[PDB]
Amino acid sequence: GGMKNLIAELLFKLAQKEEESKELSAQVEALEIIVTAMLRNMAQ
Amino acid sequence: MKNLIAELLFKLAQKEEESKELSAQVEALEIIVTAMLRNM
Ligand SMILES: [Cl-]
Ligand SMILES: [Cl-]
Ligand SMILES: [Cl-]
Ligand SMILES: [Cl-]
Ligand SMILES: [Cl-]
Ligand SMILES: [Cl-]
Ligand SMILES: [Cl-]
Ligand SMILES: [Cl-]
């Protein structure tokens, strides 16, 4: 019924946000490495 | 089951907040990289 469906929808939303979060984390790490590289470059 | 819903919701909330923070970070870092690129 409604509660089980709600649970399903919540779990799906959760799965989505988890994937999204992992992607964002990956991006943050990438960007951090890039910035660090350029700062090390500026330090010469 | 009600427990399951509650915990699911909690976890979800946590993930949403995490995603918010991370998105903010990506924005900041993108601005930074853009600046440092325009610099070089
Ligand atoms: Cl929902
Ligand atoms: Cl999925
Ligand atoms: Cl994304
Ligand atoms: Cl990476
Ligand atoms: Cl340095
Ligand atoms: Cl119940
Ligand atoms: Cl930030
Ligand atoms: Cl960029």
From Swiss-Prot, chain A:
Belongs to the IraP family. This is Anti-adapter protein IraP. It is found in: Cytoplasm. Inhibits RpoS proteolysis by regulating RssB activity, thereby increasing the stability of the sigma stress factor RpoS especially during phosphate starvation, but also in stationary phase and during nitrogen starvation. Its effect on RpoS stability is due to its interaction with RssB, which probably blocks the interaction of RssB with RpoS, and the consequent delivery of the RssB-RpoS complex to the ClpXP protein degradation pathway. Residues 3-38 form a coiled coil. Changing L11S: Loss of ability to interact with RssB. Induction: By phosphate and nitrogen starvation, and in stationary phase, via the alarmone ppGpp. Interacts with RssB. It comes from Escherichia coli (strain K12).
